[PDB]
Design a protein around this ligand. Structure first.
Ligand SMILES: Cc1cc2nc3c(=O)[nH]c(=O)nc-3n(C[C@H](O)[C@H](O)[C@H](O)COP(=O)(O)OP(=O)(O)OC[C@H]3O[C@@H](n4cnc5c(N)ncnc54)[C@H](O)[C@@H]3O)c2cc1C
Ligand SMILES: Cc1cc2nc3c(=O)[nH]c(=O)nc-3n(C[C@H](O)[C@H](O)[C@H](O)COP(=O)(O)OP(=O)(O)OC[C@H]3O[C@@H](n4cnc5c(N)ncnc54)[C@H](O)[C@@H]3O)c2cc1C
Ligand code: SF4
Ligand code: SF4
Ligand code: SF4
Ligand code: SF4
Ligand code: SF4
Ligand code: SF4
Ligand code: SF4
Ligand code: SF4
Ligand code: SF4
Ligand code: SF4
Ligand code: SF4
Ligand code: SF4
Ligand code: SF4
Ligand SMILES: O=S(=O)(O)CCS
Ligand code: FES
Lengths: 148, 651, 291, 137, 183, 374
C-alpha cells in the first residue's frame, strides 16, 4: 500500500473514526486518454510486442491492463511509467474475484467493432498463460484458488 | 429481515403425480426466513390466490415464493395477486417445478422431489436478496402498425381503423390481398375468392384512419411497448402513383417477358406490370432487374406516370403496438424426389393448379398439361405433401390441404364432368362448420374418388407424358398402379421467405413448426412473449380464411387494449451505475447495442451513466463491468450468487 | 491411400476374377490393398441379421477388429459386406450398450473394438477421394458400349447413416462408367432391387428371379449391351439367375453381366483371361465382340 | 453418486426450450437445475467459477442462436467469454468438458432434451468434480 | 373373427425387447409411430409379385397377431430399405422386420437353406466356402491358391466357435457339435 | 386440455379470478337474460338474478353448512357421477366463491342455519330483476354434449360400463367425485382395458348430425395419455374413421400418443357394443378396415367420444336475441369467411362453441375477435 494510505488508516483508528478505502477503479487516477466512444480492443499484444503510445489508454492499445478491474489509490504509477497495471491493489468492494471480472471485461470489448463476426478463438489462443495474466496477486482469494 | 411464504403447487397431478409436494412443503419450512409454507392443488386459482393474500396480511410476509409452472406463463398473474395484498411484485420469486422438473422426470420420482426441493431453496435464496422495484409507467403512442397486406392483416387494420385508431398497413408486394387473391374459389362455400376480398381491399385503401404503404417494407424497429419507433422503406416502383391510372397500355408494348411470381411460374408477365387485374392500389410497377430502359412504355403513357430516376423513400413513424401478419408460403416439393416435382412436366403443386383454374389466370381458367397444353382426362391429387412427414422435417398438418383438394376437384368437375379425379389421402380432415358436409358432397354429388393410401412414388411415361401413381389401397390391402394425365401435389404450408428478417426486426420466437410462436395457445393465442407485438393469420400457423379473419379481429382487440389505456407498465429490470464505484473505464459503453450507457462528467470526474429509456435490461454491460459498479436490478450478481449457493446449501 | 481389403465370400471363392480386376485397378489408382488376414463372412445381414442381430454385430465387430489391430480403414467391392461392416461400425460408435455387449463377447477371444475403423465402398472411394478424372487418365482400351447400371440397395441405403447423397436419383456410378467411354442408359425402375437380398434368393428363389427378370427386360429395352453391378450377390443373381430363368421361366436373354472393377479392368487394358469371364454362367463373348 | 449440474438459461430462448420439452413431456436426467437470466449476456466467468467452487460437477449455459438474441448481441459477448473460460478451466485442472454451452431456441425442446442427456453422460463418465473436497481440507 | 383371446398384448414390446440393445431401443420402438399410411407397401418390390403387404406386418405387430412370426410373408422382404427411406413417420421398417425375423427364428421358423448357410459360416467361417475349382481358378488368374480368409486360418475359425457358443447361435440353429450337423 | 396437457384450471382459473374483480365488468352469476328489446346501440335488457337464498356479501365460502345438510342431491357438474347437497358450490375453485340452496330439494329443516356464522341464509329471498341499457350483445352460451342413448347398439343407458367422454373427464379430474380415479360404475374397479369410440353423435345421418364435432379425436387421445400416465399397464384402443389433429402441435400429439404412450388405434366405426352380464365387461364389434377382418375385442370400460350439440337454452336465447341457426343447429354467423363472429342482426355477436364445435384456443380467439367487432 502507498505510505500515505497506511497513515490515513492508522490515523483514523487513533482518532476513533472508521477507515474508508477508495471505491473507484484505477482508470480514474490514471492520466491516460480514453476514447469518448468507449473501449475497443483489436489484437492482444504481449508486454514486449511493440513500443506503446504514452498518451492513449493501454487497454485500447491491446495490452492486458488490470486497472479496469483494480481498486484505485496507488496513483496508477504503472501506466504512467509505460506498462500495464498488473492489478496489485486487488478488486473493488463490489468484486469478489478480480480475474474473473478482468476476463469478462477483456472478452466483451475484444473485437467489439466487429462484434458479430469477430472470431472468439483469437483471444484464448493469443493468451498462453491465463492464470498468471489475471490472478497474479489474487489467486488465493479467487473462487477456484488452486489447480487440481 | 425476510419473512418468506412458500407455496408448492400440485397443478392437479401434473406436479403432484411425480413431485411429492407435501414433502417439499415440509422441507421449505426448514429453510431460513420461511415463516409459512403450504401446498394447494391449484395455486393460481381463487382459493390458491386468496391463501397467499390472507397469509401476507396475517403473517406480515415481505417475500413470496411459488413452486409451480414456468414464470413465462404465470409470472404476471402472481405479481398482480401479491400486489393486491400490498406486497411489491418484485419481492415475489417463482420456482419452476413443473416443466423444468415433474414433466421431465416422471419415471424418477424420488430424484424429482429432491430436485424440486433444490429449486425451492434456490428460489428462496434469491428471494432473500430481492428488492422492491417500481413498474415504469410509460405512455402509449396512439398508432398501430400492421405488417402484411393479406386477408388477416386487412382485417386487423380495418377493425382498429373502425375503432378510431390511426393505423399503418405495410405490404411487401405492389398489392394487398395476399394468397387469397391467387385462389379462384374458397371452400366450403366455393365463393369466388377475390370477389369477396376485393371490397375489403378497396375499403382499407380509402380508409380515413388507415395509411397504406404498398410495395413497402419495415426495415428497422426500435423501442418497447407503446414507444416503438419504426422505419418503413417505400420501394421505388419507378412510376408516379398520383399520375398513374392503371390502364395497362404500357404492358401491351413492353418487349421484356418475365415469369409471373403471382402465377407461380405458369404465366409470363412484362417488366412493367400489375400483379392481378383486381389489384389494389390499381397502379403499375417496373421490375428494374429485367427492364432494359428502351422507353417504349413511356410513349403510350398518357399522364406521364413513369420516372426511372426514383429514390425509394424511408418514412419514420412512432407506433404503440405492432401486429405481424406476413402469412405463408407453399412447400417446395422438389425434395420428395419420388413424386418427380421439377423433373416431370405434368406434376404440379396445388397452388399452381389454383392459378390455372382461376379465370384471371395465365391459362384463362383452363386446367392444362404443361407438356402439351392438353386438358387432362384423369387427375390424381396427392395429400400431405410436405406435411405429417419427418423426412422433410415437417411433422405437422397444414390444416387446409384436405379441404382445398376436394374443392379444386369440384371445380374441375363443374368445368368438365367427365374428368376422373382421384384423391390419395391418409385422413380427410374436414373439421369445421360445413367441412364434413363439403366432404360428403364431393363424393356424393361430384363423384370425386378417394383412395386411402399415401403414394410411394410417381413414374412418368416418357413417351406420352402421362404419370403412373404407385400406392396401396389400404382399405383393400392391394397395391394400385393407376395412370393419370396430371398429378397434383397438395403441398403444405411453410413460413414465408422473409419470416427470418421479420423475426429479427420484431424480436419474436418460432414454434417447432417454424411459424411464429404465440404467448400461450389458450391463455393468449394472438399475443407474443414480447409485449406490444402481436400475431394474425397463417404466419402464426397453418389455418383457413375464417380462422385468419378471426385472428385479425382478435389481434386488433388485443392490440387495442394498450392503445385504449394510453399507459402501460414496463419491467424496471434495468441497469444502473453506482457513481461511487465507477471510475470510467469505458468497457460498458460499446457492449450496449442500444447505446444506453454513456460516459459523462460528474463532480469533476468521469463516470458512466445509463439512459433508462434506452436500456432493455439484457444484462451484458453489468456482466462486462470489471468494477461491479454497473448492476441490473432483479438480476444483481449477489442475487445470482445466492441462487448458485441455493442448489448446494441454505443461506 | 492404404486400406485393408475385405474380400468376403462370393468374390474370392466363386467370381475370383473380380478380385484380380480390383487389385490391378486399385493399384493403378494408387491404393495399397493390405491383406486383411483371417477375415471371415461379413457376416451376410440377410441371414445373420435375420437369425440373430447380436450374432451379426458380434461377428462383424470381430472382422472390424482385424483392421483395427492393423491400424487402417476397410475398403470393399461388395454392397452386402459394405452394408454389414458399415452398419456395424456406425452402431458400435453410436450405441454404447451394443458396444459393451459386443466387447464382453469379444473379450473371450482376446479382442476389443475401440471405434476407430471406417468402412468405405470402392465406388464412393473412387468418386470422393481419388476422382473420376483419374479413371479416364488410365483408360487404355476405351469401352464404347451401352451399360445397364445396377446400383444395388445396400450401397447408398440407408442414406441417413451412409451420407452418400440421394438414393432416388444417384449419379455416382453413372459418371464412373461413362469415364471409360460407355453410356449409362436410363431404364425403368433403375433403383429397384435385384431380388436376391435379405436371404430371398435362398428361401424364395422364384420370387427373386421374378424381380431380376424385370430389371433385365427394362435394361434391354433401354438399349443396354450388358449390366454392370457393384455387388457379387447382384452379379450372381444377374448371371447364375439367367440360367435359372431359362430352365424355369423359359426366357433367354444371353445378357452379359459384369462387375464395376471387371468393367474398369477391360478399360485399363486388362487381359480377358485374367478377368475370369469364362467361369461366368452367361457368356461375356457377345460383348467382347463389341469391344 | 449422481452428478450435480447447474444450468444458466436465457429467458427468451433456452429457458423457453427447456419449457417446450416440459410441455412435450420430453424426459431427461434429473441432475441439472436451471437459473433464469434475461440474456446469456448476463453470464460471465464469475458465475461459472462460483458454481464450481460450490460443488458443480458440470455447468451448462443456454442462449439464443447466434443472430437471434432477443437483446441483439448479448450472446456474442458471452461467446467470447466462454471460449477463454474453457481454457482457464484447463489451467485450473478442471476438464473443458465439465462446462458446456449451447444455442437453443424457444422451440428447440428436442435439442434441449438431447443436450441434457448427452451432458449428463459426459459428466457421469468423468466422475465427480473433486474441487470442493480439496478446499475443505 | 379376431377375438381378444387370440391376440398377444405384449407382441409389440416383445419385438422392441428383441431389438434391444441391437439394433437399439429407439430404432425398433419406431414401429409404435406407424400410422398405417401404406407408403411402405406401395414402395415394396416384393409386394408387386406376392400377397406380402409391408404395412400389415406392422399392423399385426401392433394389434398382437403372433401368427405374423409364423408367416412366410416376412421372409419375402429383400431388405432393400426403400420403405425405410420413404416412411414419413421415421419407422425403421427394414430394421423392425429383421428383428421380427429374429423372434421368428427363436420360435423355430427358419428355412433349411438359411440354417445351411449359417452352418457354413460356423464350420468354414464363410457363407460360400472355397471348392476344389476355387484353388485352380485363383491360381490360373494370378492370385494366392488360398485367400487370406478365416477359412484357412484355424485361429480365426476357433474364435468364431467361441463367440457362437457364448451367443447361443449354435443352439438357435439347432447345431450338434459332435455330429457336426443340424437337428 | 390438449395439446399442451396443462391443467384446465391453469388457463381458466386466473381468467375467472380476474373477471370477478374487474372494475369495468359487472358479473351476474346464477342469472339469466329474460328479455331483450331494442336495436343496435339502443338495447334495453332485463336480467333475472336468481335467488340463492344466501346473502352474497355475507357469505364467506367456507362450506361448514354442506356436511350438516341431510338431503343428498346428484351434482349436475359431475354429470351424475357424484353427489352434492341442497346447499352447495359447483366445484372447489368456483367463482364467485359463494354457496347456493336448491329449494326444490331443500326441506327447510333449518339445520345449516345454526352452523352459518354470518347469518347468510335468507329463505325469504326474492329473485330480483335488473334493467340495463346496452349497445352491443355477445352470445357465448356454449354447447352441450350429445346424449348417446339414441345409438342403442352402443348400449349407453343400459350397460353400466359405457360412459360418455365428458363423464370420463369428471372421473379423471383430481377434484372429481372419484378423486381422479377412472373406475367402473358396475363394481368400482379400475379398468385394465379401455375402448374409445369416435364420432358418436357426429358424422352420422341416423342421428341428424352430419357434422364433425372438431375436438372428439383430440380429447380421446388426450384422456388416453392421462390414463396411461396414471396406469401404464392399461390397454387403450381408439376406434376411429379419421384422426382429425389439424391445428398447431395437434399431429405431433397424435404421433406422440402412439409412439410414447403406446395408445392403439383401430380404423373402424364400431357396429355395436355387447355387455357380458356375468362380469360387466363389454365386447366391441367392429371391422379393422386396414386388415379387412372383423374384430370382437373385450374391454373393461367403453368410452363414447360424444359430439357437440347446442345447449338446451339455445332456443330461448335464439328468440330473445333474434338470431338464426345453421344446418348443424348452432348459431349462424353473418358470413362464413369475412364476418365470422358477427350476425345478420346488427349489434349482436357470437363467441365460442355456440357458433359451432371448436376447441379452447379457437373459443378464446373468437372471444377476443367478437370483442373487437363489438
Ligand atoms: C393451394 C392453397 C389453397 C387454399 N385454399 C383455401 C380455401 O379454399 N379456403 C380457405 O379458407 N383457405 C385456403 N387456403 C389457405 C389461405 O391461403 C390462408 O388461410 C390465407 O391466405 C391466410 O391469410 P394471410 O393474410 O394470413 O396469409 P397471406 O395470404 O399469405 O397474406 C400475407 C400478406 O403479407 C404480405 N407480406 C409477406 N411478407 C411481408 C413482409 N416482410 N412485410 C410486409 N408484408 C409482407 C404478403 O405479400 C401477403 O400479402 C389455401 C392455401 C393454399 C396454399
Ligand atoms: C369431453 C371434452 C373434452 C374436451 N377437451 C378439450 C381439450 O382438451 N382442449 C380444448 O382446447 N378443448 C377441449 N374441449 C372443448 C371445450 O369444451 C370447448 O372448446 C370450450 O369449453 C368452449 O367454451 P365456450 O365458452 O365457448 O362454451 P362453454 O364452455 O360451454 O361455456 C358456455 C357458458 O355459457 C353459460 N350459459 C349457457 N346458457 C346460458 C344462458 N342462457 N344465460 C347465461 N349463461 C349461459 C354456461 O353455463 C357456460 O358457463 C373439450 C370438450 C369436451 C366435451
Ligand atoms: S491504462 Fe489501464 S489503467 Fe490507465 S486507463 Fe487505460 S486501462 Fe485504465
Ligand atoms: S499494479 Fe499495483 S500499482 Fe501498478 S497500477 Fe496496478 S495497482 Fe497501481
Ligand atoms: S402506367 Fe401509364 S400506362 Fe402503365 S398504366 Fe399507369 S397509366 Fe396506363
Ligand atoms: S422500359 Fe422498355 S422495357 Fe423497361 S418496361 Fe417500359 S418497356 Fe418494358
Ligand atoms: S390437411 Fe389433410 S392433407 Fe393437408 S396435411 Fe393435414 S392431412 Fe395431410
Ligand atoms: S464499465 Fe463498469 S466501470 Fe468501466 S465504466 Fe462502465 S461502469 Fe464504470
Ligand atoms: S443492460 Fe443490456 S441494455 Fe441495459 S444497458 Fe447494459 S447492455 Fe444496454
Ligand atoms: S410407412 Fe411407415 S407409416 Fe406409412 S405405413 Fe409403412 S410403416 Fe406405418
Ligand atoms: S425392405 Fe423389405 S419391406 Fe421395405 S421394401 Fe424392400 S422389401 Fe419391401
Ligand atoms: S397453473 Fe401453475 S399454478 Fe395454476 S395450477 Fe397449473 S401449476 Fe399450479
Ligand atoms: S356457511 Fe354461511 S357462510 Fe360459510 S359458506 Fe355455508 S353459507 Fe357462506
Ligand atoms: S336446510 Fe335446506 S339447506 Fe340448510 S340443510 Fe336442511 S336442507 Fe341443506
Ligand atoms: S373429431 Fe375425430 S371424432 Fe369427433 S367427429 Fe370429427 S372425426 Fe369423429
Ligand atoms: O442381404 S444379403 O446379405 O443377403 C445380400 C447382399 S446385398
Ligand atoms: S436473449 Fe437469449 S442470448 Fe440474448
Amino acid at each position: 500500500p502507498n505510505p500515505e494510505m497506511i497513515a490515513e488508516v492508522v490515523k483514523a483508528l487513533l482518532e476513533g473514526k472508521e477507515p474508508e478505502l477508495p471505491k473507484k477503479n484505477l482508470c480514474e487516477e490514471c492520466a491516460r486518454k480514453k476514447s469518448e466512444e468507449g473501449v475497443a480492443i483489436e489484437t492482444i499484444k504481449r508486454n514486449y510486442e511493440g513500443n506503446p503510445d504514452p498518451e492513449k489508454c493501454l487497454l485500447e492499445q491491446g495490452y492486458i491492463c488490470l486497472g479496469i478491474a483494480t481498486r484505485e489509490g496507488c496513483g496508477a504509477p504503472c501506466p504512467s511509467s509505460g506498462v500495464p497495471c498488473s492489478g496489485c491493489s486487488g478488486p473493488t468492494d463490489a468484486v469478489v474475484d478480480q480475474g474473473a471480472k478482468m476476463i469478462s471485461a477483456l472478452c466483451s470489448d475484444f473485437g467489439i467493432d466487429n462484434d458479430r463476426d469477430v472470431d472468439p478463438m483469437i483471444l484464448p489462443k493469443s493468451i498462453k498463460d491465463k492464470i498468471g495474466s489475471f490472478y497474479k496477486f489474487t489467486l488465493p482469494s479467487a473462487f477456484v484458488p488452486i489447480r487440481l | 429481515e425476510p419473512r418468506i411464504g412458500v407455496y408448492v403447487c400440485h397443478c392437479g397431478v401434473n406436479i403432484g403425480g411425480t413431485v411429492d409436494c407435501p414433502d417439499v412443503t415440509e422441507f421449505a419450512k426448514t429453510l431460513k426466513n420461511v415463516v409459512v409454507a403450504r401446498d394447494y392443488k391449484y395455486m393460481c386459482a381463487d382459493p390458491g390466490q386468496e391463501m397467499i393474500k390472507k397469509d401476507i396480511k396475517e403473517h406480515n410476509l415481505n417475500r413470496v415464493v411459488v413452486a409451480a409452472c414456468s414464470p413465462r406463463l404465470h409470472e404476471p398473474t402472481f405479481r398482480r395477486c401479491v400486489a393486491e395484498a400490498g406486497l411489491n411484485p418484485f419481492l415475489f420469486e417463482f420456482a419452476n417445478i413443473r416443466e423444468h422438473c415433474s414433466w421431465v422426470h416422471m419415471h424418477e420420482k424420488e430424484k424429482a422431489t429432491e430436485k424440486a426441493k433444490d429449486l425451492v431453496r434456490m428460489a428462496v435464496a434469491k428471494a432473500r436478496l430481492l428488492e422492491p422495484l417500481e413498474f415504469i409507467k410509460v405512455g402509449v403512442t396512439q398508432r398501430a402498425l400492421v405488417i402484411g397486406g393479406g386477408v388477416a392483416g386487412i382485417q386487423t387494420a380495418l377493425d382498429l381503423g373502425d375503432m378510431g385508431f390511426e393505423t399503418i398497413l405495410v405490404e411487401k408486394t405492389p398489392s394487398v390481398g395476399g394468397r387469397m387473391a391467387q385462389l379462384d374459389k374458397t371452400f366450403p362455400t366455393n365463393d369466388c375468392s377475390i370477389c369477396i376480398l376485393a371490397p375489403k381491399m378497396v375499403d382499407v385503401a380509402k380508409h380515413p384512419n388507415v395509411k397504406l404503404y404498398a410495395y413497402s417494407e419495415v426495415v428497422d424497429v426500435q423501442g418497447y411497448v407503446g414507444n416503438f419507433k419504426v422505419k418503413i422503406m417505400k420501394k421505388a416502383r419507378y412510376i408516379d402513383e398520383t399520375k398513374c391510372t392503371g390502364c395497362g397500355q404500357c404492358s401491351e408494348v413492353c418487349p421484356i417477358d418475365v415469369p409471373n411470381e403471382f402465377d407461380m411460374g405458369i404465366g409470363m408477365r412484362k417488366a412493367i406490370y400489375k400483379p392481378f387485374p383486381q389489384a389494389v392500389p390499381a397502379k403499375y410497377t417496373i421490375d428494374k432487374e429485367h427492364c432494359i430502359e428502351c422507353g417504349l412504355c413511356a410513349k403510350v403513357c398518357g399522364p406521364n406516370a413513369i420516372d426511372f430516376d426514383q429514390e425509394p423513400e424511408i418514412i419514420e413513424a412512432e407506433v404503440g403496438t405492432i401486429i405481424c401478419a406476413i402469412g405463408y408460403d407453399a412447400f417446395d416439393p422438389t425434395v420428395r424426389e419420388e413424386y418427380g416435382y421439377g423433373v416431370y412436366d405434368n406434376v404440379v403443386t396445388a397452388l399452381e393448379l389454383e392459378r390455372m383454374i382461376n379465370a384471371s389466370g395465365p391459362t384463362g381458367g383452363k386446367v392444362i398439361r404443361l407438356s402439351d397444353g392438353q386438358k387432362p382426362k384423369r387427375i390424381a391429387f396427392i395429400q400431405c405433401v410436405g406435411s405429417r412427414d419427418a423426412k422433410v422435417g415437417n411433422k405437422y398438418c397444414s390444416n387446409v390441404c384436405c379441404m382445398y383438394a376436394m374443392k379444386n376437384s369440384q371445380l374441375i368437375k363443374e368445368k368438365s364432368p367427365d374428368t376422373e379425379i382421384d384423391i390419395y389421402y391418409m385422413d380427410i380432415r374436414a373439421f369445421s362448420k360445413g367441412y364434413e358436409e363439403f366432404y360428403e358432397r364431393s363424393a356424393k354429388q361430384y363423384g370425386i374418388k378417394f383412395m386411402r393410401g399415401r403414394p410411394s412414388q410417381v413414374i412418368e411415361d416418357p413417351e406420352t407424358g402421362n404419370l403412373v401413381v404407385r400406392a396401396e389401397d389400404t382399405l383393400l390391402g392391394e397395391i394400385l398402379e393407376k395412370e393419370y394425365d396430371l398429378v397434383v401435389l397438395s403441398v403444405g404450408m411453410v413460413p414465408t421467405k422473409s419470416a427470418d428478417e421479420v423475426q429479427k426486426i420484431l424480436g419474436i420466437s418460432r414454434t417447432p413448426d417454424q411459424f411464429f410462436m404465440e404467448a400461450h395457445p389458450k391463455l393468449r393465442p394472438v399475443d407474443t412473449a414480447t409485449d406490444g407485438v402481436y400475431l394474425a393469420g397463417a404466419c402464426q400457423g397453418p389455418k383457413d380464411i375464417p380462422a385468419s379473419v378471426a385472428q385479425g379481429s382478435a389481434a386488433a382487440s388485443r392490440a387495442a387494449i394498450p392503445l385504449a389505456k394510453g399507459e402501460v407498465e414496463v419491467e424496471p429490470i434495468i441497469a444502473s451505475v453506482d457513481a461511487e464505484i465507477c471510475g470510467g473505464c469505458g468497457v460498458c459503453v460499446k457492449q450496449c447495442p442500444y447505446g444506453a450507457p454513456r460516459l459523462v462528467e460528474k463532480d469533476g470526474k468521469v463516470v458512466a451513466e445509463v439512459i433508462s429509456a434506452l436500456c432493455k435490461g439484457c444484462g451484458t454491460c453489468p456482466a462486462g463491468c470489471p468494477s461491479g459498479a454497473l448492476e441490473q436490478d432483479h438480476f444483481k450478481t449477489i442475487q445470482l450468487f445466492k441462487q448458485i449457493e441455493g442448489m448446494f446449501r441454505d443461506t | 491411400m492404404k486400406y485393408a481389403f475385405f474380400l468376403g465370400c462370393i468374390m474370392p471363392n466363386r467370381y475370383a476374377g473380380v478380385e484380380a480386376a480390383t487389385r490391378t485397378v486399385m493399384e493403378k489408382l494408387g491404393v495399397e490393398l493390405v491383406d486383411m488376414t483371417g477375415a471371415s463372412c461379413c457376416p451376410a445381414p440377410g441371414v445373420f441379421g435375420s437369425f440373430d442381430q447380436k450374432t451379426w454385430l458380434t461377428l462383424a465387430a470381430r472382422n472390424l477388429c482385424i483392421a483395427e489391430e492393423m491400424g487402417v480403414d476397410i475398403v470393399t467391392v461388395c454392397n452386402g459386406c459394405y452394408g454389414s461392416l458399415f452398419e456395424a461400425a456406425h452402431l458400435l460408435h453410436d450405441n454404447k450398450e451394443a458396444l459393451n455387449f459386443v466387447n464382453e463377447k469379444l473379450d473371450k477371444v482376446g479382442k476389443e473394438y475401440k471405434g476407430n475403423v471406417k468402412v468405405r465402398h470402392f465406388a464412393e472411394l473412387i468418386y470422393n477421394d481419388i476422382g473420376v478424372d483419374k479413371i479416364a487418365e488410365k483408360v487404355e482400351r476405351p469401352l464404347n458400349i451401352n451399360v445397364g447400371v445396377h446400383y444395388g440397395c445396400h450401397f447408398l441405403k440407408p442414406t441417413d447413416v451412409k451420407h452418400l447423397g440421394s438414393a432416388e436419383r444417384p449419379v455416382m456410378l453413372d459418371e464412373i462408367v461413362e469415364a471409360t467411354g460407355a453410356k449409362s442408359v436410363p431404364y425403368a425402375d433403375k433403383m429397384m432391387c435385384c431380388g436376391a437380398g435379405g436371404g430371398v434368393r435362398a428361401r424364395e428363389l422364384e420370387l427373386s428371379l421374378d424381380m431380376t427378370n424385370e430389371k433385365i427386360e427394362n435394361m434391354i429395352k433401354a438399349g443396354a449391351d450388358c449390366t454392370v453391378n457393384v455387388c457379387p450377390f447382384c452379379h450372381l443373381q444377374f448371371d447364375r439367375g439367367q440360367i435359372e430363368i431359362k430352365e424355369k421361366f423359359g426366357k433367354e436373354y444371353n445378357f452379359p453381366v459384369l462387375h464395376l472393377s471387371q468393367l474398369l479392368g477391360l478399360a485399363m487394358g486388362m487381359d480377358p483371361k485374367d478377368l475370369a469371364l469364362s467361369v461366368h454362367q452367361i457368356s461375356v463373348d457377345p460383348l467382347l465382340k463389341k469391344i | 453418486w449422481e452428478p450435480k449440474i447447474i444450468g444458466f438459461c436465457c429467458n427468451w430462448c433456452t429457458y423457453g426450450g427447456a419449457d417446450t420439452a416440459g410441455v412435450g413431456r420430453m424426459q431427461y436426467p434429473p441432475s441439472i437445475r436451471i437459473i433464469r437470466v434475461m440474456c446469456s449476456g448476463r453470464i460471465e466467468p464469475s458465475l461459472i467459477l462460483k458454481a464450481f467452487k460450490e460443488g458443480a460437477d458440470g455447468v451448462f449455459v443456454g442462449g439464443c442462436h447466434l443472430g437471434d438474441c432477443h437483446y441483439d448481441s448479448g450472446n456474442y459477448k458471452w461467446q467470447r467469454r466462454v471460449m477463454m473460460l474453457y481454457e482457464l478451466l484447463e489451467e485450473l485442472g478442471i476438464e473443458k468438458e465439465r462446462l458446456n454451452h449451447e444455442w437453443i431456441s424457444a422451440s428447440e425442446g428436442e435439442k434441449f432434451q438431447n443436450t441434457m442427456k448427452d451432458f449428463y453422460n459426459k459428466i457421469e463418465a468423468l466422475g465427480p468434480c473433486k474441487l470442493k473436497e480439496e478446499l475443505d481440507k | 373373427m379376431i377375438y381378444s383371446s387370440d391376440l398377444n398384448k405384449n407382441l409389440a414390446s416383445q419385438i422392441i425387447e428383441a431389438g434391444t440393445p441391437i439394433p437399439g431401443d429407439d430404432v425398433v420402438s419406431s414401429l409404435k409411430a406407424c400410422y398405417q399410411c401404406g407408403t411402405c407397401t406401395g414402395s415394396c418390390p416384393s409386394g408387386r409379385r406376392t400377397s406380402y403387404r409391408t404395412r400389415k406386418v406392422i399392423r399385426k405387430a401392433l394389434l398382437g397377431m403372433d401368427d405374423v412370426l409364423d408367416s412366410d410373408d416376412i421372409w419375402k422382404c429383400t431388405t432393400c430399405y426403400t420403405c425405410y427411406e420413404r416412411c414419413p413417420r421415421d419407422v425403421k421398417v427394414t430394421e423392425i422386420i429383421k428383428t421380427i425375423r429374429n423372434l421368428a427364428a427363436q420360435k423355430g421358423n427358419m428355412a433349411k437353406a438359411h440354417k445351411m448357410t449359417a452352418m457354413y459360416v460356423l464350420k468354414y467361417g464363410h457363407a460360400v466356402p472355397a471348392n476344389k475349382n476355387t484353388a485352380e481358378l485363383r491360381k490360373s488368374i494370378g492370385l494366392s491358391e488360398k485367400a487370406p480368409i478365416a477359412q484357412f486360418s484355424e485361429k480365426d475359425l476357433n474364435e468364431m466357435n467361441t463367440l457362437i457358443k457364448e451367443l447361443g447361435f449354435d443352439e438357435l440353429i439347432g447345431f450338434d457339435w459332435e455330429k457336426g450337423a443340424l437337428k
